[PDB]
Amino acid sequence: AQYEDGKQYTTLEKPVAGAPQVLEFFSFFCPHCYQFEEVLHISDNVKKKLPEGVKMTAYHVNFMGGDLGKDLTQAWAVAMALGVEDKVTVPLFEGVQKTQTIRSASDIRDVFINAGIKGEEYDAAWNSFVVKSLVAQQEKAAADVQLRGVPAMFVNGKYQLNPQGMDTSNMDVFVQQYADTVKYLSEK
Numbered sequence: 001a002q003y004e005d006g007k008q009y010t011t012l013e014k015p016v017a018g019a020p021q022v023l024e025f026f027s028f029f030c031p032h033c034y035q036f037e038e039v040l041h042i043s044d045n046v047k048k049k050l051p052e053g054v055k056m057t058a059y060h061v062n063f064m065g066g067d068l069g070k071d072l073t074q075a076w077a078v079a080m081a082l083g084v085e086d087k088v089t090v091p092l093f094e095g096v097q098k099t100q101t102i103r104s105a106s107d108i109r110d111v112f113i114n115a116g117i118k119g120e121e122y123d124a125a126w127n128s129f130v131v132k133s134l135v136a137q138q139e140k141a142a143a144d145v146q147l148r149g150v151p152a153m154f155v156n157g158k159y160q161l162n163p164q165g166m167d168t169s170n171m172d173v174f175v176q177q178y179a180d181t182v183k184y185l186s187e188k
Contacts, residue, residue, distance in 0.1 A: 007165040008181040012158055016144045019157025020057035022050065022182060025142060025150050028072050028096045029064040033151045038093055040171060042151070045179040054186050058085070059138040061150055065096075071105040072096070077134035078112070078125040087115040155185035 005011050024043060026033040036042040047056050060076035062069050072092070079085045091111045095102035102108055112122045125131055145154050153161040166177045 003181065003184050007162065008177065009155075009159045009162050009165075009185055012145065012154070012160060014146070016141075016154075016157030019141070019144065019154065021054045021156060022046065022056045022186060023141065023145075023154045023157075024056065024058040025061050025145075025147055025152045025154075026058060027061050027064040027069065027150050028076075028092045028102075029069060030150045031097065034093050034097050036151045037089065040175050042153075042175060042178055045175050046153075046182045049179045049183045051183065051186055059141055061142055061147065062139065064150075068096075068103070068105075068108075071108055073138055074126065074131060074135055075105075075108045075112070077131040077138070078122060080134055081125050081128070081130050082117065082121065084112070084115065084117060087117075088112060091115065153182065155182060156188075159185045159188070161185075 003009070024046075026037070043056060043058060050056065060073040062073050065072065075088075075092070076085075079088050088111055091114070092102070092108070095107065095111055102111070109119075109122055109126075113119060144157070145152070145160070155161070161178065161181060163174070163178060166174055166181070168174050
């Protein structure tokens with residue numbers, strides 16, 4: 001078959017009840033996640049092909065970067081709570097990996113301030129229990145798919161994308177295949 005379990009995707013031995021329809025894990029410290037988002041634009045290419053009524057969810061992970069990695073998962077919770085993911089994704093990736101100007105929680109906050117989030121608004125979100133719950137949700141979701149590394153993407157809590165089984169010859173053929181596989185899985 002054109003799509004095969006073990007080729008473009010694998011199947012979770014323990015499917016996750018109630019999981020987001022399309023769930024991406026990443027770290028702003030992960031070099032391959034930087035390529036996925038800033039060079040390949042995997043998330044946007046996937047979103048453009050999702051069936052009607054299917055949304056993409058993206059969660060940050062703690063296991064890269066120590067203290068700052070956890071601060072970034074909390075800041076990503078703030079971005080989710082405030083609905084500013086599209087304002088801060090590029091400056092967080094570039095701040096951590098390109099300019100390496102993000103070295104502390106204050107430097108993360110500066111990205112939000114510079115993007116026009118008011119200081120009081122960021123700080124109230126950072127300290128909120130809504131954000132504490134969002135951190136816990138990101139952690140629980142990684143546990144539920146037995147996450148071992150990033151980038152990673154899971155469809156309907158049942159299928160894990162397998163980019164190492166796709167055609168990696170041309171970067172744009174690869175992005176197309178990745179996005180087409182997510183669409184296929186979302187309809188399975």
